[PDB]
Amino acid sequence: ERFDATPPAGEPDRPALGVLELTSIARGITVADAALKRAPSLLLMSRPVCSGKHLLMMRGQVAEVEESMIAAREIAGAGSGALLDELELPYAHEQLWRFLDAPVVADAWESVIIVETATVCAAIDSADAALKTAPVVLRDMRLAIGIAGKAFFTLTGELADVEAAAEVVRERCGARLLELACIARPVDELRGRLFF
Amino acid sequence: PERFDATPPEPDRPALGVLELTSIARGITVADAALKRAPSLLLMSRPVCSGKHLLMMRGQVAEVEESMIAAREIAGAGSGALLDELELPYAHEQLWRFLDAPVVADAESVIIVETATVCAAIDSADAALKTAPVVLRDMRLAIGIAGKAFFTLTGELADVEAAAEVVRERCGARLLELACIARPVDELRGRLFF
Amino acid sequence: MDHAPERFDATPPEPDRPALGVLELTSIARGITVADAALKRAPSLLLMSRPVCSGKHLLMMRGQVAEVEESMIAAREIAGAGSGALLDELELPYAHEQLWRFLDAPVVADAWESVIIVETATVCAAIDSADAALKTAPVVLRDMRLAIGIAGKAFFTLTGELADVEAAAEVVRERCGARLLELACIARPVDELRGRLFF
Numbered sequence A: 001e002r003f004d005a006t007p008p009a010g011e012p013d014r015p016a017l018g019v020l021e022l023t024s025i026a027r028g029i030t031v032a033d034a035a036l037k038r039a040p041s042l043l044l045m046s047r048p049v050c051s052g053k054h055l056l057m058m059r060g061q062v063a064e065v066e067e068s069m070i071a072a073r074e075i076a077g078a079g080s081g082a083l084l085d086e087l088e089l090p091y092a093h094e095q096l097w098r099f100l101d102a103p104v105v106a107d108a109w110e111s112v113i114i115v116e117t118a119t120v121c122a123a124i125d126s127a128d129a130a131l132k133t134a135p136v137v138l139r140d141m142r143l144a145i146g147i148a149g150k151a152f153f154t155l156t157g158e159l160a161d162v163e164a165a166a167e168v169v170r171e172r173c174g175a176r177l178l179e180l181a182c183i184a185r186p187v188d189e190l191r192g193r194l195f196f
Numbered sequence B: 001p002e003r004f005d006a007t008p009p010e011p012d013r014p015a016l017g018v019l020e021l022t023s024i025a026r027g028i029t030v031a032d033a034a035l036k037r038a039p040s041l042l043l044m045s046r047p048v049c050s051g052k053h054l055l056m057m058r059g060q061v062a063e064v065e066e067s068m069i070a071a072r073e074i075a076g077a078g079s080g081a082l083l084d085e086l087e088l089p090y091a092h093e094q095l096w097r098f099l100d101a102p103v104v105a106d107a108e109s110v111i112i113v114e115t116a117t118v119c120a121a122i123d124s125a126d127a128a129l130k131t132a133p134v135v136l137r138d139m140r141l142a143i144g145i146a147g148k149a150f151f152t153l154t155g156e157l158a159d160v161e162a163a164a165e166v167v168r169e170r171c172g173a174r175l176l177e178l179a180c181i182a183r184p185v186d187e188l189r190g191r192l193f194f
Numbered sequence C: 001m002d003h004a005p006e007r008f009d010a011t012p013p014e015p016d017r018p019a020l021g022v023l024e025l026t027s028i029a030r031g032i033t034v035a036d037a038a039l040k041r042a043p044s045l046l047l048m049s050r051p052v053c054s055g056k057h058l059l060m061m062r063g064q065v066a067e068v069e070e071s072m073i074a075a076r077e078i079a080g081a082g083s084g085a086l087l088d089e090l091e092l093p094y095a096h097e098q099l100w101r102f103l104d105a106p107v108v109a110d111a112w113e114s115v116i117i118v119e120t121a122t123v124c125a126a127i128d129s130a131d132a133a134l135k136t137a138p139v140v141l142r143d144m145r146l147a148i149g150i151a152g153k154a155f156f157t158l159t160g161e162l163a164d165v166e167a168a169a170e171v172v173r174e175r176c177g178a179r180l181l182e183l184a185c186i187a188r189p190v191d192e193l194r195g196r197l198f199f
């Protein structure tokens, strides 16, 4: 519903995505409350996830998310501070939307890169940048769950395309990048399905 | 599955013992010793996230008391494996249905309590439920959150404020964070986690 | 190598694939490249390629003895590039038949007299220990959980006559070495634990 790439019938365009990654679930709930009271952003999730972090996502118009996130950071940073990472994308890539809610493993798809990040925000941030840089396709993604708060995703395409994407991923992730693997020609046995 | 019933159809088994162990192997031995020592009823014996082992038992006060004595001796053997424990002569009725699995409420203030151990969560909630006119709405023990726990209590602001003081007292340093939201947003109304 | 469910069969439906290779990696991305290298080197059958709790990656393969040996050589090189990503590994030329049905998913026995519970720091240690025990003493593998929901740890249970599970315990300790976290032996579990130890 709220994760649609383009609006459902009758809804205004809400292209912007805000993501907050918090060390405290209790803090996360209060951060969400502050965000939604400040501006009429749409809450997409408010979730404890593995490692014991709390994941908040919201969408809205650019100005709405900007405003909600300002309120979110103030609360998130209160006291000892609980903000591990954050992301604001004014215009999140259409491919990205269907991967936010739950882990996705591809059945079928080409070269591939596998990107492994220290935070959920780094994965979403770098994937968005990658998808906008080269005509690559997001195939797999796992945000936090079952991998102790890490994240990873895969992108496929022509070899040069995924190499171009890989450069942008490195730049966008910075030190949040844990590992990036490129396989120009996966064995037949791995092609299409990398996780099974 | 009815073993988590607040009241029996069967004898009354009001008291709760919980043991939180760092070793699954030790956990099994602790359970065996506890159930041999006294006729407590085992509710769960579960590996949970972070790789700890969670034991719960219920019975008469004297029974849980004796089972728990035996549990501690074994749990404390060698380098020791007991991370936390709880013994309640009487667990609040609302609490029983939240022990077995994570619960998210479908549907006026709230406090959210976040603890370092499962026992701290159960201990806190029980005390709060016994002190203030609050309602337990959400709870998650260990699973998916690296061994911590959290729960939610609702009521009037004075109610959850009263609860919160009790929660702080019982948790001690096991309390990680406690948050109060006097009027949660519509999107957060009823359901806080989704 | 990936698709069909019979691939975990103790005996073939197909030629014999008695040997087992297991790789336990700290990086999911490296794990995929390791898998690719392994299967490019020799035609081993890949059984799984799985991120698991603690955020490590689990690879298992089976094949004829020589195939698994050569795939693992290729795997070790890639896993070790730059900084090693190999947490643990196992190569068994002849994996005990009982072991095959416990690889794909956690198993809890519903019903069985004496038992040992083995708890290891790595997945490979559990599989390695279990194999040694099943070959050495007349015991039965009942429960096993590899990594998932227990932060990368593993445990398994073996049942049998009391002297038999005691002998197994000795073998498990030897094979695990420092990878052993805890081992418990219960000669007579209470009836409430008998059959089901985990619930």
Ligand code: SF4
Binding pocket: A049, A050, A051, A052, A145, A146, A147, A148, A149, B048, B049, B050, B051, B143, B144, B145, B146, B147, C052, C053, C054, C055, C148, C149, C150, C151, C152
């Ligand atoms: S990673 Fe595995 S063990 Fe750690 S919290 Fe998530 S599920 Fe539990």
